[PDB]
Ligand binder design. Structure first.
Ligand code: HEC
Ligand code: HEM
Ligand code: HEM
Ligand code: HEM
Ligand code: HEM
Ligand code: FES
Lengths: 62, 241, 67, 81, 379, 106, 109
């Protein structure tokens, strides 16, 4: 039997205070970069042809 | 003491929560102002900065801006300008002055329409109806000559002669121009006016929501985690008695 | 031409019951008005009501029907 | 004095408790709690709701009472005279 | 307290008015409010502040600046509404804080009450001036009304009008005087805030049960702090939810209309929360009568602690009065909608009805009830 | 001027006395009293056997509030069940200021 | 502290940080300054305040308002200078407070 990630991760990170805090400080970076991107479509995928991002393709670069 | 009518609520491109504006009609409805409302009612508050939001290419509306302006500039080097240059500029007012404005419309004072939506009760359908409705004077009524009978007007008589008929104009697209369409194509325009951020601002709405459902159960977990002890109490009265 | 969907949709709604119903009252008013319009009598009150439910019908229809 | 020390005098109480890790944040949360809804929701509801109902009537009552009073002039006096 | 970081600066010894503040066991969410209140106050402070920067009060120009604010200023629009949209929320945060007061009748604490009294009275007056700032028509006339309401004092009334005015009109002085007040004022309130807390830390908190809980207390730092953490942010949601999706919902005041001194709007009501007070103004035909009616009407709160007659505190064990308690609740909520309407007769009478109804509820019924329960309960 | 109606009164008592949770919640009429400065002096004169058994309830009592869990309805306190134990000692101190105050008049 | 009006409101107990604050015997006028400082601060607060009323900052207009202030405003002139003329005085009140500092080197605290 092998320790589930938690047993590992706790021994890995949450135990040592910084280490615990460290990945916490890490996670948000990629997160928001991933988060900001992934959500926008959900907004945008719903909003289609009503915005020059879609509209101005009619007249953009002439 | 008129029964105050209320406009039936219409669906809209923006009506729903996440429902956005569509600039295609917005572009068109502009021309209307560029055609019609520049007659009297002004809008003072927006620069030519619209460009790409109403889809106008930087050049497109700039060159479009260029023609709009053009006044004096030679008073002993003290000026304003012809030909606006940049986008910061606003529209020329068809009247310099309420005196000049009102007399021209003969006692009527055309309002500036910039925020007027937020002024009037009942959103856009107020106007779209007010656009639509013109009725035949009932038997037993008369009007001031300029006043034209619509129950939508509060006193139900308005000096505004109905502007909109089918094909008042030709759209920028070339879409066949229709009283209702010409009317309805504008109704998105001012809806945009008072809130340029409207389209943009909704983003935060979806942004915050999924952000929001995160933490509360999380918090809700933590709290309980502490309270887990208190609600777990036991008591024992074991008096030496 | 172009005929609109707008006024097009009107008649299908004003076809409905309460429309002509009050529309009769409009006559009933105006009929009574007709000679008696010498008196204060006027039908504006009624026509509001007619138009009131009129377009609620029109609501569900022609907006979807326009461009 | 020192807030906790001199509070009161107490004798022969005993307390029993666990680490929070010993247990869970949902010890039959659904199952156990859902009944509790009633005994509280029934407790006050006897004492509280009805006054509002009276209000709500008045809301429609007076409005309706208002409505006729103006809305139709050819009512008390019809447009005859 | 050996090497405790509490005493090392003497300052943090004071900080032990919190960590080790003992606390009652059973506590409704309804005790979040006291702490909840200050929250709004802070978050506000910043908003109107950065807003204060780009805005200017100049009778001709001022309103124009605002247009500039939500439009061309970086994120100018989110900010205006924030400071505003906190306001009503804050008030609903208010009454609740009061609300807990009587339902547990904690007003047994004596001058503390009176403090909580005055503390409020200023606050409403504050945003009143704050509401002038937008310089809307409804602002203008609403401003114009209440001073014109003041004048009725039999001898000295006159000057004080044009004294506060600083003239015959609503003009600059009237405005830009206030832009000091509507601004300078709330700080002193904050200064006052702590005082209102001090007294409470004479005796320690009150409970739900009207029973001294001293047998059990709790260190504050671990726990209620948490429930705060929850209780705090919850506010923000609706607060942030209203603001974006349906900004103008509570933005029921409609006037961005540049105020016309000549022109009058079809309707004048103050904003939502005054209105019952304003409603009661209408009631008395005597214009002076309504004044001593209106202003006194709230002053009753001072008078409550005089009327506690019972032998047990918290209402939740006296069922009968509880009815009155709720009975009063809607009665307040009633005057709203009446106040929410013009001056036609069916409402008028109805409005005329609840007025004297109102006092009777508090002033007589409440003191009357408990007496009998004692006798009923053999006390 | 009540005899049969006297009997007819007690129901509402017994009813009303059941209409306030402390009968369900395990209290008495005594322990629910508002605080009085005499009660202080009163509580002084209580012997522990009396004094203590008052106490342990409150501790037990409040606890349920946090969890809102009312006692099993049988174990609820009963109307016939009563003890005024507090009041008689309360009664004395009352008179005491009266006498003093009375003398204190002139 | 029997029936002392210091403890009756708890507040005035704090007020006993002053009445009974012990104090040194030999003291230069040079120890007036600490208390002296706050004086200016108060008197100021009012002046710029009532001044703040009629004045407005608008880049084009603002300065003009000031002209209006010392001229057409009731006693407008006395007031402007006050708020100003306190300022430097206050600063000279400042350094002295410092001045005492080193000359007795009290910075040991
Ligand atoms: C005849 C010049 C003119 C035309 C063209 C014109 N306006 Fe009208 N408009 C007026 C005047 C003048 C009034 C008020 C008449 C009166 O007061 O009796 C008015 C009425 C209005 C009103 C309602 C009055 C109010 O107080 O809000 C609005 C809104 C309005 N116009 C906007 C528009 C719109 C939308 C169009 C395009 C359909 C338009 N104007 C075209 C001059 C004009
Ligand atoms: C924004 C205004 C106020 C703030 C910031 C404020 C702050 C607080 C805080 C932090 C508490 C402690 C927690 C609590 O008991 O609620 C409190 C308690 C209290 N306040 Fe204030 N309060 C305010 C308004 C008032 C008002 C208007 C009143 C009375 C009219 C008042 C009277 C009380 C009372 C009686 C308590 C104790 C209530 C109890 O024992 O449950 N407070 N207040
Ligand atoms: C509880 C705290 C406060 C309340 C209820 C309040 C009241 C108001 C009111 C009624 C308005 C106008 C409402 C509106 O514009 O929609 C407003 C806006 C404003 N308030 Fe306050 N005020 C408070 C604290 C402050 C603070 C802390 C500041 C400045 C730091 C301030 C300054 C302003 C300013 C400058 C505005 C202009 C923004 C605007 O009017 O749109 N107020 N505030
Ligand atoms: C307006 C600014 C200040 C005010 C209102 C103020 C207020 C006071 C007061 C009331 C005292 C007690 C009386 C006295 O000892 O002078 C005091 C003392 C003192 N202050 Fe401040 N002070 C101010 C500025 C400063 C500054 C700028 C410093 C140091 C840079 C300072 C350091 C001290 C010291 C060292 C003492 C004790 C001096 C002694 O023992 O004689 N203070 N201050
Ligand atoms: C030690 C306290 C203060 C100092 C040293 C100070 C500094 C100044 C300065 C340098 C000026 C311009 C000097 C001049 O106009 O001749 C001034 C004027 C002004 N100060 Fe302050 N300030 C202080 C406190 C305040 C306060 C409390 C207020 C407002 C309540 C305030 C607001 C103003 C205003 C509104 C003016 C305009 C009057 C004018 O500039 O002529 N300042 N103050
Ligand atoms: S004060 Fe103008 S009508 Fe009452």
């Amino acid at each position: 039997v092998a320790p589930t990630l938690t047993a590992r991760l706790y021994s890995l990170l949450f135990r040592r205070t910084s280490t615990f805090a460290l990945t916490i400080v890490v996670g948000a970076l990629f997160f928001e970069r991933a988060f900001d991107q992934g959500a926008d479509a959900i907004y945008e995928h719903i909003n289609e042809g009503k915005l020059w991002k879609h509209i101005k393709h009619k007249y953009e670069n002439k | 003491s008129d029964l105050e009518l209320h406009p039936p609520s219409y669906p809209w491109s923006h009506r729903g929560l996440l429902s956005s504006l569509d600039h295609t009609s917005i572009r068109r409805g502009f021309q209307v102002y560029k055609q019609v409302c520049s007659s009297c009612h002004s809008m003072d508050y927006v620069a030519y900065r619209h460009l790409v939001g109403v889809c106008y290419t930087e050049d497109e509306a700039k060159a479009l801006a260029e023609e709009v302006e053009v006044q004096d500039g030679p008073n002993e080097d003290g000026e304003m300008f012809m030909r606006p240059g940049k986008l910061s500029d606003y529209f020329p007012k068809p009247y310099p002055n309420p005196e000049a404005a009102r007399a021209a419309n003969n006692g009527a004072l055309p309002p500036d329409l910039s925020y007027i939506v937020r002024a009037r009760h009942g959103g856009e359908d107020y106007v779209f109806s007010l656009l639509t409705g013109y009725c035949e004077p009932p038997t037993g009524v008369s009007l001031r000559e300029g006043l034209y009978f619509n129950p939508y007007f509060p006193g139900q008589a308005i000096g505004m002669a109905p502007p909109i008929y089918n094909e008042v104009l030709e759209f920028d697209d070339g879409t066949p121009a229709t009283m209702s369409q010409v009317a309805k194509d504008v109704c998105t325009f001012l809806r945009w006016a008072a809130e340029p951020e409207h389209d943009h601002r909704k983003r935060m709405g979806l942004k915050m929501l999924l952000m929001m459902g995160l933490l509360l159960p999380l918090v809700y977990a933590m709290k309980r985690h502490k309270w887990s002890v208190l609600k777990s109490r036991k008591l024992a009265y074991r008096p030496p008695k | 031409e172009l005929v609109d969907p707008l006024t097009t949709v009107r008649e299908q709604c004003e076809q409905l019951e309460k429309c002509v119903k009050a529309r009769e009252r409009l006559e009933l008013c105006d009929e009574r008005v007709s000679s008696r319009s010498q008196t204060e009598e006027d039908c504006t009150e009624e026509l509001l009501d007619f138009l009131h439910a009129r377009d609620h019908c029109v609501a569900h229809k022609l907006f979807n029907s326009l461009k | 004095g020192r807030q906790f020390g001199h509070l009161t005098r107490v004798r022969h109480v005993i307390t029993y408790s666990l680490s929070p890790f010993e247990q869970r944040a949902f010890p039959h949360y659904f199952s156990k709690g859902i009944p509790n809804v009633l005994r509280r929701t029934r407790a006050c509801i006897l004492r509280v709701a009805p006054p509002f109902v009276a209000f709500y009537l008045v809301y429609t009552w007076g409005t309706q009472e208002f409505e006729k009073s103006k809305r139709k002039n050819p009512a008390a006096y019809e447009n005859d005279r | 307290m050996t090497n405790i970081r509490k005493s090392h600066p003497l300052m943090k010894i004071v900080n032990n008015a919190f960590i080790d503040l003992p606390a009652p066991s059973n506590i409704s969410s309804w005790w979040n409010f006291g702490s909840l209140l200050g929250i709004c106050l802070i978050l506000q402070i910043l908003t109107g502040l950065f807003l204060a920067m780009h805005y200017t009060s100049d009778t001709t120009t001022a309103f124009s600046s605002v247009t500039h604010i939500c439009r061309d200023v970086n994120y100018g629009w989110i900010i205006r509404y924030m400071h505003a949209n906190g306001a009503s929320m804050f008030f609903i945060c208010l009454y609740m804080h009061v609300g807990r007061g009587l339902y547990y009748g904690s007003y047994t604490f004596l001058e503390t009450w009176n403090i909580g009294v005055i503390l409020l009275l200023t606050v409403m007056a504050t945003a009143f001036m704050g509401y002038v700032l937008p310089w809307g028509q409804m602002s203008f006339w609403g401003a114009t009304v209440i001073t014109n309401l003041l004048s009725a004092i039999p001898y000295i009334g006159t000057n004080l009008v044009e004294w506060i005015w600083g003239g015959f009109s609503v003009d600059k002085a009237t405005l830009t005087r206030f832009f000091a007040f509507h601004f300078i004022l709330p700080f002193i309130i904050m200064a006052i805030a702590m005082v209102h807390l001090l007294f409470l830390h004479e005796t320690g908190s009150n409970n739900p049960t009207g029973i001294s809980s001293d047998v059990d207390k709790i260190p504050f730092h671990p726990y209620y702090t948490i429930k705060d953490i929850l209780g705090a942010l919850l506010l923000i949601l609706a607060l942030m939810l209203l603001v974006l999706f349906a900004p103008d919902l509570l933005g029921d005041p409609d006037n961005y209309t540049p105020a016309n001194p000549l022109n009058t709007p079809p309707h004048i009501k103050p904003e939502w929360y005054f209105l019952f007070a304003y409603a009661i103004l209408r009631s008395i035909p005597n214009k002076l009568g309504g004044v001593l009616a209106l202003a006194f009407s709230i002053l009753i709160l001072a008078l409550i602690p005089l009327l506690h007659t019972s032998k047990q505190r918290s209402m939740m064990f006296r069922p009968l009065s509880q009815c009155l308690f709720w009975a009063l609740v809607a009665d307040l909520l009633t005057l709203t909608w009446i106040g929410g309407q013009p001056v036609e007769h069916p409402y008028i009478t109805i409005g005329q009805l609840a007025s004297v109804l109102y006092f009777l509820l508090i002033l007589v019924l409440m003191p009357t009830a408990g007496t009998i329960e004692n006798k009923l309960l053999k006390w | 001027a009540v005899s049969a109606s006297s009997r007819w009164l007690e129901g509402i008592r017994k009813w009303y006395y059941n209409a306030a949770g402390f009968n369900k919640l395990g209290l008495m009429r005594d322990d629910t009293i508002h605080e009085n400065d005499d009660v202080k002096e009163a509580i002084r004169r209580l012997p522990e056997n009396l004094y203590n058994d008052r106490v342990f309830r409150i501790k037990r009592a409040l606890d349920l509030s946090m969890r809102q869990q009312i006692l099993p309805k049988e174990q609820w306190t009963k109307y016939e069940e009563d003890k005024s134990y507090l009041e008689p000692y309360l009664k004395e101190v009352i008179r005491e200021r009266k006498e003093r105050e009375e003398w204190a008049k002139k």
